[PDB]
């Protein structure tokens, strides 16, 4: 934990760090290039306070008028089966699809959960099309409206690209207000000035500018309804009209009670007709204001008459359907039509009187609009270069927190200084070799073999004046490479010109005979058992040129065998007939064989894999050797990576 | 306790921590899915101050008129016997039951405690029904009003699902105020703007919008009524004072000024938009309690695991004993496993560690004054006889003659485990009624000669001092290669300190987590006081997580 090898292991794990930071930056690149752009338009409104207006504009009265004005409760998207199909379609430059529905009436499922009935439009051509609600595809053409199965749809000016899919959602009025209000925003920027900067944010540019203009013009028309309402006859008209409508409302509910005191199509057409009648009323009283606020040739008024000719066609079709079903249903349908149509008109009139009164107590005079809304061509979200740099630092921080975590993950040896701090004479650091015959005779110039020759020299100095010429090499663990080092060391000492004997006293799972080529019978175990002679067990590794004694058959009592005095006799004989004797023993952390053979060994060494065996294992192994009367001369680090080994090619 | 130790014990106890965190998250998720949703509706009231109005709305005249308008003192709930029956009913998708009571009059018990006479409706069909007050079930039909036993019910438009139970409570008008006022809330958001955002929260979505609209209409009407009520008291005394005649005409002029004003005095409060209910419930707050469930599970798990860490005090590793200066000679791992383990399963780990003990003792047992080894557990249930018996077996198979004396005269049971002739045990020898030859045995399994305690003697320690015991040891140490003695703890009785006088080597056996370092320290000091030098300990029953041994073969 210090800057020096901080930069060190960062240079080491550069592959990892740039890998993951690059992965995160590519994620950010694809998110920034696939996230749908959002444009915001600002309009400026002038008045002569404005604190009440900051909340009056965001009221359901004003927004709720624009929703009903632009039919914003009819939602439409190009369908892309992936979550990123829209973005990639934009990236190709494909012009996004868009159609126009001046009149949509879904079957009005409107369940508690799925209160938003969804249909998909399949574009057949520029004129005709097909719509599937849940499988029943209704073929339709622009102009004529499709009025089937309680479904009324008038779509016109549909886009060019055929075969596309348009998901249509008749989301409820409250939802269509809430989303708009979430996107809409007001401010004053003067804290007292008449300047009201209105802001609206959305994806489709043209759609947002029109919505903001509709909002602004509705507010303007309301504050002009101020100036015109006071002397207007409409006030007294409403004052007198409400009582008669409520009277027929009372009469209609009385008629319901009298007749009461379920065919599916009956409710479907009933709801459809009621929706149509409510729209017909609201459009008549809407025409009432567009007539003097605007002109006949003005396109908005034309739109009113067009959408009502649509609605009158729809009512005509609905009446055609009503006439055909039984009178037992027609009677109830007419009686319910009168009733809930009366409540619809009644609720409208209550609204009507309400905001007509709003003209009165508004003290504002002229509500001039300074400049109509226009959309900034530059999208404000997704923010370019503000998530990308965040992707960069996120990759960097996850890199540091992961690399330091892995640093504090491994616990093995990292350098011979760790052992020599404990007081262990590391006699060698055998580097890892890339590479069935012995490496010391297969690839004599490999770095590991040069390091093993270095171990040979260091031993030959340290092995003199020991009580005898027996060397015991004990791995700190299985898979510490005990037999690799022992075998190659024996080869490197034999080629020198000394007679070497290699005893594999790992009676539990020794496998040197499986690697030198062997006569498996009459190994070492068969000698301790007394069923084999001393000369009949010795072999010749033709490669290394040293005599080899294999373990033979795995006996059931290893440690009980090794205590037999025949082992003493064998070593005493061999140390007279050989220059060096190397013994392989099982770990001392696992069994007690090593501490039985170390009874007789002049020198005992531990072999420790570079990053596998910990300092604790070597410490415990040396102390447990000492408890048994065996003094471990030192250690032999093994399998050290060439990054940490000082050895290199030379020649 | 370090981060490394923390993660180690966490992964070791990963079962516990994930179990507790997961179960608290299960409670959190079931609570989030069962707590009734609570919708919130809003309205916008506009005026031209607003500080009196945020208090006049919540006054009892306002709420009290809504209560009497909507009959909100008539409380209705669908019955569910469990505390979570309603929640599971919603989860199943069952449409909640609801009925309309336009006119309720209970027998009006209205006691001091039970001022809320509680009745249950049993829905028989879509038309008729039955009502049980305290068992007396009155069958009734919508339309016709039930007037029996002082109980007046006009219930109409009963729901579809029959057989249901509906608890009806005619809670007091003041209560029907207080609950609403608790749910009702007002704000200004401009600090001077006329805008007021009334919010009403409740479970039944369609009901709360109507209630909030009723509140708004009552407020509208009462403000119309007040400004007019000023002029109305003026008008009232003008009417009372009309009888001079020219002054009568002047009063008539004032009268005609005032009369029309009352009808025309409409203003100062405004419903910018009536109440609508936000379809997304505001409570229960999902994803805010479930994360609280996660964090509560995590915090309680850590505070419990740390408590358990600071709970146990037993030995945790031989390094603790070697800190005091005690040569731990072995760490026998706990074996999963009536015959000796050293002959039943000769290759088990717990036997490999005992061979590792055999070699270390063999080194440490030369230069001892004699070949008698005394092994005394630190307490009962330290496994002293397990270790001593297996050690005797593993030394017998080597080829040495071993004698295994069980000098635990108090509750020794080695004879109950080797197979025995209970007669002529050890105690029967010290009493002089048996000779040295009839006491020794032959465990056919281990192959080591065994001497049992025999009968429990009245005076154990008095027996052990008898000079025949030293005669026995002197003879055996000449006829045997090793003598292992079992002795009771030294913290309980002083037998161990009597036998230790004749033992060349003495070892303690300490169970891994049971015995504490304090017991070993006191035991060694008490052995030293009695002139017995404890060579070292033999940690026992060490769990395989902390044992260095592993299978090799």
* DSSP string computed for B77-94: EE--SSTTHHHHHHHTTP
Which range marks the domain in which residue A568 is found? 416-640
The H or E element that residue B156 is part of is strand B151-156
List CB contacts (< 8 A) between A261 and chain B. 143
d(CA A226, CA A218): 13
CATH number where B433 lies: 3.40.50.300
**Residue B127, preceding bond cis, omega within 30 degrees?**
no
**Residue A92 CB partners (closer than 8 Å, separation 6+):** none
d(CA B147, CA B152): 5
d(CA A99, CA A118): 16
What angle in degrees, to the nearest 10, is found between the helix axes of B205-241 and B60-70? 110
d(CA A241, CA A249): 12
R_g of chain B computed on alpha carbons: 46
Closest residue in B to A476 (Cα) is B548
Residue B243 carries which DSSP code?
-
Instruction: From B441, B370, B363, select the one nearest B405 (Cα to Cα).
Output: B441
| Cβ atoms within 10 Å, residue B525 | 11
Instruction: From B122, B127, B131, B125, select the one nearest B153 (Cα to Cα).
Output: B131
Are the beta carbons of A245 and A285 closer than 8 angstroms? no
Instruction: From A322, A340, A331, select the one nearest A274 (Cα to Cα).
Output: A340
Instruction: From B540, B532, B445, B450, select the one nearest B494 (Cα to Cα).
Output: B532
Are the beta carbons of B552 and A592 closer than 8 angstroms? no
Identify which of B3, B48, B549 has the shortest CB distance to residue A590: B549
Show the 3-state SS of A25-81. Answer: HHHHHHHHHHCCCEEEEEEEEECCCCHHHHHHCCCHHHHHHHHHHHCCCCEEEECCC
Distance from CA of A47 to the nearest CA of B (A): 17
DSSP character string of A503-572: EE--TTT--THHHH----SS-SHHHHTTSS-SSSS---BTTTTBEEE---SPPS-HHHHHTSHHHHHHHH
d(CA A56, CA B526): 92
**Residue B284, preceding bond cis, omega within 30 degrees?**
yes
Q: Which residue has the tokens 């809409």?
A: A184
d(CA B487, CA B411): 10
Chain B interface, mutation test: which of A479, A589, A591, A624, most B Cβ atoms within 10 Å?
A: A591
Instruction: From B463, B461, B392, B475, select the one nearest B427 (Cα to Cα).
Output: B463
Are the beta carbons of A166 and A120 closer than 8 angstroms? yes
List CB contacts (< 8 A) between B352 and chain A. 559, 590-592
R_g of chain A computed on alpha carbons: 47
Instruction: Tell me whether residues B194 and A508 touch, CB distance under 8 A.
Output: no
| Cβ atoms within 10 Å, residue B546 | 14
| Cβ atoms within 10 Å, residue B500 | 22
Tokens read off for A488: 């190659």
d(CA B162, CA A320): 39
d(CA A600, CA A472): 9
Are the beta carbons of B183 and B136 closer than 8 angstroms? no
Q: Which residue has the tokens 């040979």?
A: A456
d(CA A581, CA A463): 12
d(CA A473, CA A505): 10
What angle in degrees, to the nearest 10, is found between the helix axes of B3-12 and B14-34? 70
Residue B42 three-state SS: strand
Residue B185 carries which DSSP code?
B
What angle in degrees, to the nearest 10, is found between the helix axes of A482-494 and A447-463? 70
Distance from CA of A40 to the nearest CA of B (A): 26
| Cβ atoms within 10 Å, residue A591 | 26
Tokens read off for B315: 């030995």
Contact residues of B toward A, CB < 8 A: 3-4, 44, 46, 48, 143, 189-190, 192-195, 266-267, 270-273, 276, 278-279, 327, 329, 346-347, 352, 355-356, 358-360, 363-364, 397-398, 548-553
Resolution attained, angstroms = 3.5
Instruction: Tell me whether residues A627 and B360 touch, CB distance under 8 A.
Output: yes
Show the 3-state SS of A218-235. Answer: HHHHHHHHHHHHCCCCHH
| Cβ atoms within 10 Å, residue B101 | 19
Residue A19 three-state SS: helix
List CB contacts (< 8 A) between A61 and chain B. 272-273
Helices (H) and strands (E) in chain B, counts: 19, 18
Q: Which residues pair with A156 in a beta bridge?
A: A100
Instruction: From B394, B384, B403, B534, select the one nearest B476 (Cα to Cα).
Output: B403
Identify which of A51, A559, A587 has the shortest CB distance to residue B190: A51
Q: Cα separations (Å) of B98 from A557, B116, B162, B192?
A: 83, 20, 12, 42
| Cβ atoms within 10 Å, residue A47 | 17
Instruction: From B366, B412, B364, B365, select the one nearest B386 (Cα to Cα).
Output: B412
Tokens read off for A182: 């979430």
Tokens read off for B49: 């101050």
Q: What are phi and psi of B463, to 5 degrees?
A: -65, -50
Residue A433 carries which DSSP code?
P
**Residue A422 CB partners (closer than 8 Å, separation 6+):** A615, A618, A619
């Amino acid at each position: 934990i210090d800057l020096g090898r901080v930069i060190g292991e960062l240079i080491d794990h550069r592959k990892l760090i740039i890998s993951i930071t690059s992965v995160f930056t590519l994620f950010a690149i694809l998110y920034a290039l696939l996230a749908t752009p959002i444009y915001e338009t600002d309009a400026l409104i002038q008045i002569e306070q404005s604190a009440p207006e900051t909340a009056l504009l965001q009221s359901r009265m004003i927004l709720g008028k624009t929703i009903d004005d632009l039919n914003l409760q009819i939602q439409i998207e190009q369908k892309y089966f992936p979550v990123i199909g829209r973005g990639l379609a934009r990236l190709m430059g494909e012009k996004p699809g868009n159609i126009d529905i001046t009149r949509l009436y879904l079957p009005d499922s409107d369940d508690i959960s799925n209160n938003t009935p969804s249909i998909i439009l399949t574009v057949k051509d520029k004129e005709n099309y097909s719509i599937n609600s849940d499988g029943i595809q209704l073929n339709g053409v622009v102009g004529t409206l499709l009025n089937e199965k309680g479904i009324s749809l008038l779509v016109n000016e549909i886009d060019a690209k055929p075969g596309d899919q348009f998901v249509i959602t008749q989301l409820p009025r409250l939802k269509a207000i809430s989303d708009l209000l979430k996107s809409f925003s007001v401010a004053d920027l003067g804290k007292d000035t008449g300047m009201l900067t209105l802001t609206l944010t959305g994806d489709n540019p043209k759609r947002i500018s029109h919505i903001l203009d509709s909002i602004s013009q509705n507010y303007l028309a309301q504050n002009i309804a101020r100036q015109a309402a006071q002397d207007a006859k409409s006030l007294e008209f409403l004052n007198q009209q409400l009582p008669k409508v409520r009277a027929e409302l009372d009469s209609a509910e009385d008629k319901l009670n009298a007749y009461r005191k379920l065919n599916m199509e009956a409710k479907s057409v009933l709801d459809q007709i009621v929706n149509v009648d409510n729209q017909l009323n609201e459009l008549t009283f809407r025409e009432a204001e567009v007539s003097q606020l605007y002109t006949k040739e003005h396109p908005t008024y034309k739109a009113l008459m067009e959408k009502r000719q649509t609605l009158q066609e729809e009512k005509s079709k609905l009446n055609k359907r009503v006439s055909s079903m039984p009178s037992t249903q027609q009677e109830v349908l007419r009686l319910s039509r009168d009733v809930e149509s009366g409540r619809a008109v009644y609720l409208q009139l209550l609204n009507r009187q309400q905001e007509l009164n709003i003209a009165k107590s508004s003290a504002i005079g002229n509500v001039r609009i300074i400049d109509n809304a226009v959309t900034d061509p530059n999208p404000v979200r997704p923010k370019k270069t503000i998530i990308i740099v965040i992707g960069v630092v996120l990759g960097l921080i996850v890199s540091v927190v992961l690399v330091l975590f892995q640093v504090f993950l491994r616990r093995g040896i990292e350098s011979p200084e760790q052992l020599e701090e404990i007081g262990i004479n590391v006699y060698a650091s055998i580097p890892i070799s890339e590479w069935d015959t012995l490496l010391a005779v297969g690839n004599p110039a490999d770095l590991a073999v040069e390091a093993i020759r270095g171990l040979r020299t260091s031993l030959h100095f340290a092995m003199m004046e020991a009580k005898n010429n027996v060397l015991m090499i004990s791995g700190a663990s299985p898979s510490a490479g005990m037999t690799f080092i022992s075998s190659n060391l024996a080869a490197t000492i034999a080629i020198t010109g000394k007679k070497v004997l290699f005893i594999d006293a790992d009676l539990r799972k020794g496998y040197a005979h499986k690697m030198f080529g062997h006569k498996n019978d009459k190994g070492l175990s068969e000698f301790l058992s007394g069923q084999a002679a001393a000369e009949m067990i010795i072999d010749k590794v033709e490669g290394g040129g040293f005599d080899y004694i294999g373990r033979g058959q795995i006996p059931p009592n290893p440690a009980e065998l090794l205590m037999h005095p025949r082992f003493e006799q064998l070593l005493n004989w061999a140390s007279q007939n050989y220059d060096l004797i190397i013994i392989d023993t099982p770990p001392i952390l696992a069994v007690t064989d090593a501490a039985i053979i170390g009874r007789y060994a002049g020198t005992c060494l531990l072999v420790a894999r570079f990053e596998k065996n910990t300092v604790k294992e070597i410490d415990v192994s040396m102390k447990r050797f000492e408890q048994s009367g065996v003094v471990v001369k030192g250690c032999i680090l093994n399998g050290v990576v060439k990054k940490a080994s000082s050895y290199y090619r030379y020649g």
